[PDB]
Amino acid sequence: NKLIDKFGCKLITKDMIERMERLTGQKAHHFFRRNIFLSHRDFEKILDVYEKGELFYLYTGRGPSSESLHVGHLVPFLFTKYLQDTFKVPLVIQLTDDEKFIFKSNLTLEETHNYAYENMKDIIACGFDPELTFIFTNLEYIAELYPDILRIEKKISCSQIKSIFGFKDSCNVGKFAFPAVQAAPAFSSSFPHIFGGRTDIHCLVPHAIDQDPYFRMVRDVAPRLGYLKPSSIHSIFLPSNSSIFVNDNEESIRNKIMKYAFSGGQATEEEQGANLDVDVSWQYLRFLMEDDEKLEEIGKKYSSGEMLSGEIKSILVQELVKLTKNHQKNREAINDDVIAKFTNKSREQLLK
Amino acid sequence: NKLIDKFGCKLITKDMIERMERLTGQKAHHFFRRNIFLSHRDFEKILDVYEKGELFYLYTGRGPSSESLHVGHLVPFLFTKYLQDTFKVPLVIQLTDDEKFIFKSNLTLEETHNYAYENMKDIIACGFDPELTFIFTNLEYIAELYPDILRIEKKISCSQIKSIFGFKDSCNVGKFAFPAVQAAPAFSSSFPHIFGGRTDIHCLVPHAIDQDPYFRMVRDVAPRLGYLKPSSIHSIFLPSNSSIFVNDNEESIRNKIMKYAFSGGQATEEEQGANLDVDVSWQYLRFLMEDDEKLEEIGKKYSSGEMLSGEIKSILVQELVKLTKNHQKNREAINDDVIAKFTNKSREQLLK
Ligand SMILES: N[C@@H](Cc1c[nH]c2ccccc12)C(=O)O
Numbered sequence: 001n002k003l004i005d006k007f008g009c010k011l012i013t014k015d016m017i018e019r020m021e022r023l024t025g026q027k028a029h030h031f032f033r034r035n036i037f038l039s040h041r042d043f044e045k046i047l048d049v050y051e052k053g054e055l056f057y058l059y060t061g062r063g064p065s066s067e068s069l070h071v072g073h074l075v076p077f078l079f080t081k082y083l084q085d086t087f088k089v090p091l092v093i094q095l096t097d098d099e100k101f102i103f104k105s106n107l108t109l110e111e112t113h114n115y116a117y118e119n120m121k122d123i124i125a126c127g128f129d130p131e132l133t134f135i136f137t138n139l140e141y142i143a144e145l146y147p148d149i150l151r152i153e154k155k156i157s158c159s160q161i162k163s164i165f166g167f168k169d170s171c172n173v174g175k176f177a178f179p180a181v182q183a184a185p186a187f188s189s190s191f192p193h194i195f196g197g198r199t200d201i202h203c204l205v206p207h208a209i210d211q212d213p214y215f216r217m218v219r220d221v222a223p224r225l226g227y228l229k230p231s232s233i234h235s236i237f238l239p240s241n242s243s244i245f246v247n248d249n250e251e252s253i254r255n256k257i258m259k260y261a262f263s264g265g266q267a268t269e270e271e272q273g274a275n276l277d278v279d280v281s282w283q284y285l286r287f288l289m290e291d292d293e294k295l296e297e298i299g300k301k302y303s304s305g306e307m308l309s310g311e312i313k314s315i316l317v318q319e320l321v322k323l324t325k326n327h328q329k330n331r332e333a334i335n336d337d338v339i340a341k342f343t344n345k346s347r348e349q350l351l352k
Numbered sequence: 353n354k355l356i357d358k359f360g361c362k363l364i365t366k367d368m369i370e371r372m373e374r375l376t377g378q379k380a381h382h383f384f385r386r387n388i389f390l391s392h393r394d395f396e397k398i399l400d401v402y403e404k405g406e407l408f409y410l411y412t413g414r415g416p417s418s419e420s421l422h423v424g425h426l427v428p429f430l431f432t433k434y435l436q437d438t439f440k441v442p443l444v445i446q447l448t449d450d451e452k453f454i455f456k457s458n459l460t461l462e463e464t465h466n467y468a469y470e471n472m473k474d475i476i477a478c479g480f481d482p483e484l485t486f487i488f489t490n491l492e493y494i495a496e497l498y499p500d501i502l503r504i505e506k507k508i509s510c511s512q513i514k515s516i517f518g519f520k521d522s523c524n525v526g527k528f529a530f531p532a533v534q535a536a537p538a539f540s541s542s543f544p545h546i547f548g549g550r551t552d553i554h555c556l557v558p559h560a561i562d563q564d565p566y567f568r569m570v571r572d573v574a575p576r577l578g579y580l581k582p583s584s585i586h587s588i589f590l591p592s593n594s595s596i597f598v599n600d601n602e603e604s605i606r607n608k609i610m611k612y613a614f615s616g617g618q619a620t621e622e623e624q625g626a627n628l629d630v631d632v633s634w635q636y637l638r639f640l641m642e643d644d645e646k647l648e649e650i651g652k653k654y655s656s657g658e659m660l661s662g663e664i665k666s667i668l669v670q671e672l673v674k675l676t677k678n679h680q681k682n683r684e685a686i687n688d689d690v691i692a693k694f695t696n697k698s699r700e701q702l703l704k
């Protein structure tokens with residue numbers, strides 16, 4: 001909220017929420033109710049465009065630093081699926097095997113590439129439509145992005161990078177060269193095989209609020225390239241070696257909440273209450289629980305001291321395993337042939 | 353030749369030159385004798401390798417800022433053909449359409465890409481063997497280079513780039529990102545479809561001395577990647593916005609020497625002599641004239657004053673048009689099918 005000012009994003013008022021629901025014909029995701037996606041840039045443009053019968057596209061991404069996604073990383077992906085189902089628009093997903101090899105001394109491109117492909121399985125396991133979704137790694141799609149990477153780079157000073165991402169002269173040049181790579185897919189030109197070279201297809205970018213810098217930068221260069229400014233919709237972080245992965249079994253999950261999940265309850269049972277703003281388990285349930293009436297009542301009871309830290313952690317565990325089990329079976333149905341449909345660069349479509 | 357030592361280069365020795373002629377059965381190309389290629393880094397390593405029956409490869413390049421190559425730009429290319437004929441080794445040639453779009457405000461990728469393809473025709477017109485030569489533009493081969501680009505970038509600080517190329521914070525980030533692109537082909541890993549993934553094939557890089565910075569940098573990162581240091585052999589530039597292009601007609605050529613070619617002769621005929629170190633026409637004939645006996649005698653007569661500036665400029669004109677006519681007919685034999693042979697990324701070969 002102090003970060004929303006210094007970035008210069010606007011809050012998503014109810015009037016926007018009511019408009020999307022109004023235009024879509026579907027109930028708003030709970031990530032809106034609960035201010036999980038709380039922030040945007042020019043999201044009102046997207047609804048303007050969709051109001052006019054015009055199509056647009058979604059862009060989101062993932063950095064493969066681990067073989068499996070955290071559950072926290074499903075927050076933007078699950079939300080994007082909802083947006084794809086609601087607007088029925090194409091989606092574009094970048095796996096940044098280049099970035100994480102660059103920004104993490106303890107990594108190689110062989111590992112990042114493999115982690116990328118496993119990560120795709122977790123991503124597809126969220127139930128995206130392959131007829132509407134194009135997924136790709138930077139190592140494999142770099143040539144298609146290169147022309148827009150070069151155009152963005154020519155318009156930004158090295159000093160502007162420092163100013164935006166806070167790098168220093170001591171940083172490796174790879175760090176300076178990546179932002180353009182992440183910026184590039186927010187322009188329709190970077191996907192000739194779906195949009196046909198058109199430059200007039202608006203892009204909407206769901207992302208954790210910490211990714212905002214890349215898209216602040218690209219919104220500044222857009223006009224100088226005669227391109228549309230991409231719109232953004234921001235989520236808050238999902239708070240914290242080992243945190244909860246989507247391929248964790250029931251025992252792993254229970255083990256981690258009980259030992260590593262910071263409680264807001266009193267040390268002993270001096271609960272005739274608890275602090276919900278610091279309780280990690282409460283904040284997790286806010287993302288997961290589709291039942292509103294349960295949530296308020298859990299929050300009330302755990303606040304007032306008629307629920308111990310022990311019980312709130314158990315409720316979360318069973319929610320996490322329901323989530324993680326449903327994702328794990330969906331993942332079993334994902335083979336190289338299913339991947340191929342998502343990775344297939346060509347889409348015989350009529351946007352031209 | 354004090355900067356040339358300071359940089360860390362070595363002058364090419366008669367021993368080194370004799371050592372070669374001994375080892376190939378061919379008399380030495382005159383760019384050696386005339387000290388046009390005067391300098392090297394670990395060229396003695398290449399001869400060591402060739403002494404042992406082992407193969408290596410050549411890497412040279414061209415920046416397409418103009419539709420036609422200057423005659424000066426044929427100096428490294430003509431020399432490389434000689435090296436290819438003498439050692440019978442594979443060659444790899446990079447057209448940097450990315451660089452010149454990056455470094456020249458008055459350029460676009462469309463122009464640079466086209467200028468690249470016309471430039472290839474001039475390059476192929478030097479008589480390279482397509483069974484031994486692989487030519488490519490960065491826009492088209494970037495994905496194959498990307499892994500080594502990324503590996504070089506992770507090992508160099510932004511401050512190291514400033515220090516080596518003299519860039520400033522005000523410079524666009526594209527300028528910082530390009531050196532790795534030019535470095536990458538000096539490692540055999542960057543050509544899996546000829547060397548088979550092998551990292552133990554030495555590379556030799558012919559270049560104008562002003563390109564040295566890129567290969568100073570890449571020689572410093574080689575060990576940290578477990579890669580071989582590339583060797584280089586360096587040429588002095590053809591003495592210098594119109595200069596002589598390979599597609600210039602006779603009239604264009606005569607027009608340029610007479611008007612723009614700095615003479616070392618006296619203003620009027622106060623020649624009972626001339627200064628050969630400043631005379632641009634004399635220095636051009638040193639590169640061109642395959643006849644030694646003529647050259648000494650021209651130099652003597654033009655020195656002593658029994659040849660006017662007028663005649664020396666005419667001799668050069670007729671040499672230039674003989675050169676430029678032979679190149680122009682060889683260029684007429686170059687179609688997209690010929691280009692395709694050179695640009696074809698795959699080479700069924702036994703280096704593995
Ligand atoms: N940089 C993001 C991955 C990513 C790539 N493109 C994106 C677009 C939007 C949000 C995130 C991304 C990460 O570290 O995981």
Ligand SMILES: N[C@@H](Cc1c[nH]c2ccccc12)C(=O)O
Nearest residue numbers: 412413414415446534558559563
């Ligand atoms: N950047 C170089 C072209 C080049 C690329 N790779 C090279 C290797 C050797 C010599 C030249 C090159 C130029 O503008 O001239």
